[PDB]
């Protein structure tokens, strides 16, 4: 059966991971190399490096992060945050990013998905879909959740797979950071619409939330807060999930 993955989202500013959380077991929890390597060693399956500024000097600083991270970590990582075009995605993958996450640029140019997939393989292209329920209908939002595109989530999911994406990173904006649970209604809504792996994102607060995301059909669970704020232990989480039938990888724990 398909693997079920636990993925940590590391928010990045100026090539460093947003700090303020005290990893007194680490020398510098702002270092993407040291932090990513640590997560790799404690059982995280993949990383996402999300540039949350996505703007000034982002291009160069993210390239340097990729160069340093790729040579030191042994689990896959995705980069995202303001990847606007094929050349930017290409540079990141060529420097060692395993995957790139595109969102606004994909909505505005869906064949960008296909271009990356054809050059680098579909597995290198993650389409991040940020959605909200708008008057009872799931809609796609771009520009960090500030633009309702008026595109129905249902239609965009189908198009994204048609365009050759390898995975969908499905973020419920309205649960993100709330620690209130993943948007399992959204996950369940998307599940029958695509055969692609769905990375659920936004809302994780406790181990049981991960179980619910997987029961809703997620193939991976992404979380920022619970790892950033050191609220959940990765090994304890995987043991609990495996006990409840979820096909997580316990190797190396």
The dihedral region occupied by 145, where left means phi > 0, alpha psi between -120 and 50, and beta the remainder, is left
Tokens, residue 43: 């059982």
Cβ neighbours around 112 below 10 Å, total? 21
- CA dihedral 141→146→148→149, nearest 10 degrees, is -70
CA distance 62 to 107: 22
HEC letters along the chain: CCCCEEEEEEEEECCEECCCCCCCCCCCCCCHHHHHHHHHHHCCCEEEEEECCCCCCHHHHHHHHHHHHHCCCCCCEEEECCCCCHHHHHHHHHCCCCEEEECHHHHHCCHHHHHHHHHHCHHHEEEEEEEEEECCEEEEEECCCCEEEEEEHHHHHHHHHHCCCCEEEEEECCCCCCCCCCCHHHHHHHHHHCCCCEEEECCCCCHHHHHHHHHCCCCEEEECHHHHCCCCCHHHHHHHHHHCCCCCCCCCC
Active site residues: 11, 130
Using the structure block, give the residue that is written with the tokens 């579909």: 122
Residue 34 φ then ψ, to 5°: -65, -40
Whether residue 86 contacts residue 54, with contact meaning beta carbons closer than 8 Å, is answered with: no
Whether residue 126 contacts residue 169, with contact meaning beta carbons closer than 8 Å, is answered with: yes
Q: What are the chain's domains?
A: 5-243 (3.20.20.70)
- CA dihedral 226→133→99→123, nearest 10 degrees, is 120
Residues in the chain: 253
Cβ neighbours around 228 below 10 Å, total? 21
| Experimental structure resolution, Å | 1.2
Give buried/exposed letters for 123-158 (b at 16+ CB in 10 A, else e): ebbbbbbbbbeeeeebbbbbeeeeeeeebebbebbe
CA distance 103 to 169: 9
- CA dihedral 8→12→17→19, nearest 10 degrees, is -100
Residue 238 φ then ψ, to 5°: -65, -40
CA distance 162 to 195: 11
CA distance 212 to 225: 17
Q: Solved how?
A: X-ray
Q: What does each C-alpha distance from 23 to 30, 77, 147, 223, 238 come to in angstroms? A: 9, 21, 36, 17, 21
Whether residue 187 contacts residue 201, with contact meaning beta carbons closer than 8 Å, is answered with: no
Whether residue 125 contacts residue 166, with contact meaning beta carbons closer than 8 Å, is answered with: yes
């Amino acid at each position: 059966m398909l693997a079920k993955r636990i993925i940590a989202c590391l928010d990045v500013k100026d090539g460093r991971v947003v700090k303020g959380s005290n990893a007194e077991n680490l020398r510098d929890s702002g270092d993407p190399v040291e932090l990513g390597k640590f997560y790799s060693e404690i059982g995280i399956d993949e990383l996402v490096f999300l540039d949350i500024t996505a703007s000034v000097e982002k291009r160069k600083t993210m390239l340097e992060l990729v160069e340093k991270v790729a040579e030191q970590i042994d689990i896959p990582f995705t980069v995202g945050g303001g990847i606007h075009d094929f050349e930017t995605a290409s540079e990141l993958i060529l420097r060692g990013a395993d995957k790139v996450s595109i969102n606004t640029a994909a909505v505005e140019n869906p064949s960008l998905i296909t271009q990356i997939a054809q050059t680098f393989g579909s597995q290198a292209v993650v389409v991040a879909i940020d959605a909200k329920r708008v008057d009872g209908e799931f809609m796609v939002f771009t520009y960090s959740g500030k633009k309702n595109t008026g595109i129905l989530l249902r239609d965009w999911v189908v198009e994204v797979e048609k365009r050759g994406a390898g995975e969908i990173l499905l973020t419920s904006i309205d649960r993100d950071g709330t620690k209130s649970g993943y948007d399992t209604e959204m996950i369940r809504f998307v599940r029958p619409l695509t055969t692609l792996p769905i990375i659920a994102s936004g809302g994780a607060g406790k181990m049981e939330h991960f179980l619910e995301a997987f029961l809703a059909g997620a193939d991976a669970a992404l979380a920022a807060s619970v790892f950033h704020f050191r609220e959940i232990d990765v090994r304890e989480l995987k043991e609990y999930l495996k006990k409840h039938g979820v096909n997580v990888r316990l190797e190396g724990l």
